[PDB]
């Protein structure tokens, strides 16, 4: 037997950080959950009970809090890059650091139409995430994402012209409800190290804002032919707006709202143009995925 | 053996309703989860296998969708009162209907600074709830609530002067983080029937809006002496603003954010006035409850 | 405004305790989650920012661990009674202690057909719970429960003879799947204090075992006319087997398994006597409740 | 823009199947949740609103129930292989089918020491899973797993000799609690098609049973030097017992149980050899992973 793959460390590390402007009294909070898993010359911990190669997960936890004390926690792409770089530089025998960060929403409260200096509301369970893989000799691979963005449109969704055979019962529709939970990931060009990540810092918040804006506007305005066709338009617009992105991935459930035939009861009309009351279906659901990149096809376009 | 208490019916009934203004094209959606449990002369279903006294839960489910088709679903206090009244009036042997409704947020999307006619966002897992108990011969008892409103303030919370004995380790503080999930319930005066509920319909949305506004402003502006003292101020202001409320109940967890002593590492200062990085605690938590009503004490005030 | 009701304390306190037989090497573990809420002369903490009347929830947490160190944690009815009594005796101004305990399963592992001395498995998310209300001057009110016991029978469940009117679509059945999550509560006679609870200690484990045995055997052997009729038989047998119980309460969801008509596909027969493949429904569900006590009817039985 | 990756279909499809021995009256139930995602010449559904290439997820759902009606659902490796093969054979333009199955426990009830013919208990939320990737021209890749197996040992776990530097606070221990949720995956040799999967059918149940037995016995008997060292022993034994497995992967959280120093209270001794009461930590947790395969190193072993 031999170790083909190994990583270890600490998961579910909750972190809060406050910034206090002593001049204005304005406070700003940041809250996240962090996972750090290390790789390197660690196989003997598995094979030989050699704990000398283990940077204790407790120590990794201490290091997350120390890094957050001594560095910005925003944008999360930067914080993740700083943290991962620390582990591969500090420890000769550690050759990769895998940093996952989930960012929790704390939106400043408006009280009597004025922003409150130190009060916040969890305005959505929507998250902003990063996956930062720091690989010694191979730079920094960053995937940025928004997840748990739950949306619904009551019309301007269609689904007709799909394959029909002996397995098919679904009726074509020219007007249905569309509801999803948006998981959208943008994959950055490889960065050579922390200096190159730092040189692009304003692009992280800007690209997250673009991804969210494009997701909401496209969902709201596309007279959707399918989830497939709608998500492709979101991905192509985000790629057009940030050249340092290589790919945009969407993973979208089709959260069904079924019509309810009430015609058995006093001839009530609640289908088609008369549909007012629907049954939201918890399961099953459609699931639609794609990864969009830029073309290099020159023939048979 | 004898039946001391019994109720039965249908839980977790997901309901969506759309309103379509054909003039403006503006669509408005409502989504809820409904539970209806009936009481009455039903003991023989338990004791004698007498199913003749059971209004099938499947039929109760059909009735929820039919009621939603033929009546407003908003405010939920009205929808609940209509539904509960239907069961005690339709069925001679049914003497109480217990209607619980959870209302899910679908907030209209703003696209390029304009409200979209048919696109919505789940802007919070915060709920608006009702419990409506329709009791034949005893009218309609309504409890209204907001739940899952998650808030945090980074300063202007204190906790000192508490009892200290041989069980006490907690340090007094003059500056801590306060974070909670707000569960706030307002209990209406008994209504004689559906006509009296209908006569007060505008008060339901107005009182929910008042409860939320008072909760947010008080949380944000109170230099809090304790969760106890802060919630009491919220409850007294809501009672002052709606005479048809008898009681206001709060149930608030104290969701702890602990300081992290980093002085063992390079003398880093992260406690007291230098506290920037905190550890959010998932459990345990403080839990603080109270029900506030109006006084009738004339002596020893 | 005046305080009509108030309680406060600590929730979600996770507790583990190990017993080590040094003679045999056999270790036994206990794991629970504890909530303690106090009542008494505490209104000034709410009305006057008077923290002198608050036994800090942090101190209540310390007290749970100290009690567990100095006393048995089993049966949970005893541990809860000890803990609640401590608060009303130690603090003159505290007049009630509300102790909720959830007990988590750690079942000894059998390895090569022999019980392992120190290895355990979470063999079910089924819980054993207590609610212990210690009220100064009014003794100790205990409710014991089992919850999250998930069961299914594939036949010997029926549902016919229910009310049929213009709201009814459900077909009568003489053979259906029955599946539920069992919540069963037994309410003890009021105990005068801790001495009387201690005098009955063996009855707590014995009555929990009886409730579980009766629940499983009745579910498995009753050719069920309805959930109502089946749960009534469980409750009456548990009352017959423990005179110190006053009431037995069941709360049972009817977790539906729907037939799937496949006759549209190659005439496949999958309904009635040919039903093999079913669709489990996550929601909605039936919900059936009753509280059974002993009779004192002497006429019109 | 161009489609670099795409799949779509149906998730969260709950399936139940009953087998009825008419001779013995013995019934056997199977319950699972199924996901099927297809790949192939489907990019035009994304780029051109061409729904002609979509096998509707509703049709995929119908096909799961039809397959379950016409074929064994056990072992899940076989059911998954049948289902995936159907999609790549039926549809010329579909070139891969990705089938994920979660199997839910329904263990036969023993009533009065005899197995009941038609009553079952969810004896654990532990799952048995498969991932079956059917790739046209490349056969059938199967990963089998057990997940959610929650275990604890109260002693015979150690953690000492780990790296100590300026980030390290953790104390070495020679006796701690070890608790985890076991996620164990075994990767099968590539199968050429459905005939080769069928030729190995008895190996699926046997290898799952081996993986579980080895996991439980090793956890219980290993005087653990670390999670790393313990999981490596499990993986090497499972590889030794099934030559058709290429790799065994473990993913194990270290679910911490912290000692509680009570010496501040009446000198109570609850640490080290006197530790009886512990605080289970919900988060953070250690996370330890490895993939073990067979060696081909001939030098520098
Ligand atoms: C309703 N529906 C299916 O059944 N499949 C699909 C699909 O892949 N995409 C859709 O937009 N809708 C839909
Ligand atoms: C921190 N803290 C306790 O320990 N108990 C209590 C309490 O009841 N109320 C608070 O506001 N804080 C607090
Ligand atoms: C299927 N079904 C209903 O619709 N209602 C009821 C009920 O109250 N009890 C049952 O056992 N089944 C059932
Ligand atoms: C307690 N502890 C750490 O902090 N890290 C680790 C690790 O990787 N492995 C362990 O078994 N324990 C442990």
- Give the CA diameter of chain D: 78
Q: Give, rounded to a whole angstrom, the gap between the first and last alpha carbons of chain A.
A: 49
Residues D238/D186, Cβ–Cβ less than 8 Å? yes
Identify the burial level of A4 via C-beta atoms within 10 angstroms of its C-beta, where 0-12 means exposed, 13-18 middle and 19 or more buried. middle
Give the C-alpha separation, A182 to A147, whole Å: 6
SS3 C38: strand
* Residue in chain A nearest B216 by alpha carbon: A111
Query: With left for phi above 0 and alpha for psi between -120 and 50, is residue D26 left, alpha or beta?
Result: beta
Q: Where are the beta strands (DSSP E) in chain B?
A: 2-20, 27-40, 94-104, 107-111, 114-121, 127-135, 139-153, 178-188, 245-254, 257-259, 277-280, 285-293
Locate C38 and state its tokens.
């106090």
Which H or E element spans position B47? helix B43-47
Angle between helix B201-221 and B76-90 (nearest 10)? 140
Locate C19 and state its tokens.
């017993």
Length of chain D: 301
Locate B97 and state its tokens.
């209907």
Query: With left for phi above 0 and alpha for psi between -120 and 50, is residue B73 left, alpha or beta?
Result: alpha
What is residue A24's DSSP assignment? T
SS3 C126: coil
Residues C254/B58, Cβ–Cβ less than 8 Å? no
Give the C-alpha separation, B259 to B276, whole Å: 8
Residue C225 Cβ contacting ligand 3 at under 6 Å: no
∠A190-A196-A202 over CA atoms, to 5°? 100
Short-list A82, A187, A76, A99, CA closest to A142: A187
Query: With left for phi above 0 and alpha for psi between -120 and 50, is residue A118 left, alpha or beta?
Result: alpha
Which H or E element spans position A27? strand A27-40
Give the C-alpha separation, C183 to C150, whole Å: 10
Residues D137/D85, Cβ–Cβ less than 8 Å? no
For residue A235, CA distances in Å to A35, A162, A228, B119 come to 28, 23, 11, 20
Looking at the 3D structure of chain C, how many domains does it have? Answer: 1
Are residues D277 and C156, on separate chains, in Cβ contact within 8 Å? no
Give the C-alpha separation, B125 to B127, whole Å: 6
For residue B109, CA distances in Å to A153, A205, A219, B115 come to 10, 21, 10, 6
Short-list B209, B183, B195, B178, CA closest to B78: B195
* Residue in chain D nearest A252 by alpha carbon: D8
Residues A139/A81, Cβ–Cβ less than 8 Å? no
Q: Nearest by CB to C13, which of B227, B240, B284?
A: B284
Concatenating the DSSP letter of every residue in D194-232 gives HHHHHHTHHHHHHHHHHHHHHHHHHHHH--BS-HHHHHH
Residues A159/A172, Cβ–Cβ less than 8 Å? yes
Identify the burial level of C243 via C-beta atoms within 10 angstroms of its C-beta, where 0-12 means exposed, 13-18 middle and 19 or more buried. exposed
Q: Give, rounded to a whole angstrom, the gap between the first and last alpha carbons of chain C.
A: 49
Query: Which residues touch B207 (CB under 8 Å, ≥6 apart)?
Result: B144, B186, B238, B241, B242, B244, B245
Q: Cα-atom radius of gyration of chain A, to the nearest Å?
A: 24
SS3 C68: helix
Residue A62 Cβ contacting ligand 4 at under 6 Å: no
For residue A30, CA distances in Å to A22, A33, C97, D273 come to 18, 11, 38, 41
∠A270-A273-A274 over CA atoms, to 5°? 25
CB-CB neighbors (< 8 A) of D289 in chain A: 5-8, 37
Give the C-alpha separation, C252 to B9, whole Å: 11
Query: Which residues touch A128 (CB under 8 Å, ≥6 apart)?
Result: A76, A103, A144, A145, A146, A208
Residues A174/A160, Cβ–Cβ less than 8 Å? yes
Locate A123 and state its tokens.
């305005």
Query: In terms of DSSP H, where are the helices of C91-177?
Result: none
In this structure, the strands spanning D285-293 and A114-121 are unpaired
Short-list D184, D186, D185, D188, CA closest to D200: D188
In this structure, the strands spanning D257-259 and B277-280 are unpaired
Give the C-alpha separation, D271 to D258, whole Å: 10
Are residues A1 and D46, on separate chains, in Cβ contact within 8 Å? no
D55 near A CB under 8 A: yes
Residues D155/D138, Cβ–Cβ less than 8 Å? no
Give the C-alpha separation, B282 to B53, whole Å: 47
Residues C281/C257, Cβ–Cβ less than 8 Å? yes
Give the C-alpha separation, D13 to A285, whole Å: 8
Give the C-alpha separation, C35 to B253, whole Å: 12
- Give the CA diameter of chain B: 78
- Give the CA diameter of chain A: 78
How many helices (DSSP H) and strands (DSSP E) are in chain C?
Answer: 6, 12
Give the C-alpha separation, B280 to B284, whole Å: 11
Asked, as a colleague might, if the bond just before D75 is cis with ω within 30 of 0, I would say yes
Short-list B50, B25, B28, B29, CA closest to B40: B50
Which H or E element spans position B50? none
Residues A216/B121, Cβ–Cβ less than 8 Å? yes
Query: Which residues touch D23 (CB under 8 Å, ≥6 apart)?
Result: none
Chain B neighbours among A 219-258 (CB < 8 Å)? 219-221, 257
Distance from the CA of B285 to the center of ligand 2, in angstroms? 9
**CATH number of the domain residue A75 falls in:** 3.10.270.10
Short-list D128, D144, D239, D138, CA closest to D190: D138
Q: How many other CB atoms are there within 10 angstroms of residue D194's CB atom?
A: 18
Ligand of minimum distance to the alpha carbon of C54: 2
Are residues B277 and A69, on separate chains, in Cβ contact within 8 Å? yes
Q: Provide the shortest C-alpha distance from residue C293 to chain B (in Å).
A: 5
- Name the phi and psi angles at A74, rounded to 5: -130, 145
Q: Nearest by CB to D151, which of C120, C216, C275?
A: C120
Residues C57/C9, Cβ–Cβ less than 8 Å? yes
In this structure, the strands spanning A277-280 and A2-20 are unpaired
Give the C-alpha separation, C136 to B37, whole Å: 35
Chain D neighbours among B 279-298 (CB < 8 Å)? 282-283
Short-list D96, D127, D92, D84, CA closest to D5: D96
Angle between helix D76-90 and D201-221 (nearest 10)? 140
Identify the burial level of B115 via C-beta atoms within 10 angstroms of its C-beta, where 0-12 means exposed, 13-18 middle and 19 or more buried. exposed
Q: How many CB pairs under 8 A join A and C?
A: 11
A167 near C CB under 8 A: yes
In this structure, the strands spanning C107-111 and A178-188 are unpaired
Mutate to test the pocket of ligand 3, among C153, C156, C159, C164 (most ligand atoms within 8 A of CB): C159
Identify the burial level of C147 via C-beta atoms within 10 angstroms of its C-beta, where 0-12 means exposed, 13-18 middle and 19 or more buried. middle
Concatenating the DSSP letter of every residue in D106-171 gives -EEEEETTEEEEEEEE---S-EEEEEEEEETTTEEEEEEEEEEEEEEESSSB-B-S-B-STT--PP
Residues C91/C52, Cβ–Cβ less than 8 Å? no
What resolution in angstrom units was achieved for this structure? 1.6
What is residue A114's DSSP assignment? E
CA atoms within 13 A on the CB side of D80: 35
For tokens 């002198």, the residue is C52
For residue A290, CA distances in Å to A152, A156, A184, D46, D58 come to 20, 22, 10, 8, 19
Give the C-alpha separation, D97 to D39, whole Å: 6
D90 near C CB under 8 A: no
Give the C-alpha separation, A255 to B31, whole Å: 13
Which H or E element spans position A133? strand A127-135
Give the C-alpha separation, A202 to A190, whole Å: 17
For residue A110, CA distances in Å to A126, B183, B215, B217 come to 20, 20, 13, 9
∠C51-C52-C53 over CA atoms, to 5°? 90
Concatenating the DSSP letter of every residue in B180-202 gives EEEEEEEEE--BSSHHHHHHTHH
CB-CB neighbors (< 8 A) of B225 in chain C: 49, 51
Give the C-alpha separation, B289 to B254, whole Å: 11
Residues B150/A29, Cβ–Cβ less than 8 Å? no
Domain that holds residue D238: 1-301
Ligand 2 pocket (Cβ < 6 Å) reads: B 159, 170, 226-228, 254, 286, 288; C 8, 54, 56-58
Give the C-alpha separation, B296 to B294, whole Å: 7
């Amino acid at each position: 037997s031999a170790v083909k793959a190994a990583r270890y460390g600490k998961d579910n590390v909750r972190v809060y950080k406050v910034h206090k402007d002593e001049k204005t009294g304005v406070q700003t909070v940041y809250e996240m959950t962090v996972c750090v898993l290390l790789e390197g010359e660690i196989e003997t911990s598995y094979t030989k009970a050699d704990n000398s190669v283990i940077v204790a997960a407790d120590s990794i936890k201490n290091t997350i809090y120390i890094t957050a004390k001594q560095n910005p926690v925003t944008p999360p792409e930067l914080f993740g890059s700083i943290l991962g770089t620390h582990f591969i530089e500090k420890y000769n025998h550690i050759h990769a650091a895998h940093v996952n960060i989930v960012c929790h929403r704390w939106t400043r409260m408006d009280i009597d139409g004025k922003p409150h200096p130190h009060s916040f509301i969890r305005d959505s369970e929507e998250k902003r995430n990063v996956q930062v893989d720091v690989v010694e000799g191979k730079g920094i691979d960053i995937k940025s994402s928004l997840s748990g963005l739950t949306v619904l449109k009551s019309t301007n969704s269609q689904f007709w012209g799909f394959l029909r055979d002996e397995y098919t019962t679904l009726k074509e529709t020219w007007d249905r409800i569309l509801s999803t939970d948006v998981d959208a990931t943008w994959q950055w060009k490889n960065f050579s190290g922390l200096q190159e990540v730092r040189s692009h810092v304003p692009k992280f918040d800007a690209t997250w804002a673009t991804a969210r804006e494009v997701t909401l506007k496209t969902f709201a305005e596309d007279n959707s032919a399918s989830v497939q066709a709608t998500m492709y338009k979101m991905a192509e617009q985000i790629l057009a707006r940030q050249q340092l992105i290589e790919t945009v991935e969407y993973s979208l459930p089709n959260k069904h709202y079924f019509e309810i035939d009430l015609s058995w009861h006093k001839g009530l009309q609640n289908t088609g143009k008369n549909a007012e009351v629907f049954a939201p279906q918890s399961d099953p659901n459609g699931l639609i995925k794609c990864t969009v990149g830029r073309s290099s096809l020159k023939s048979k376009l």
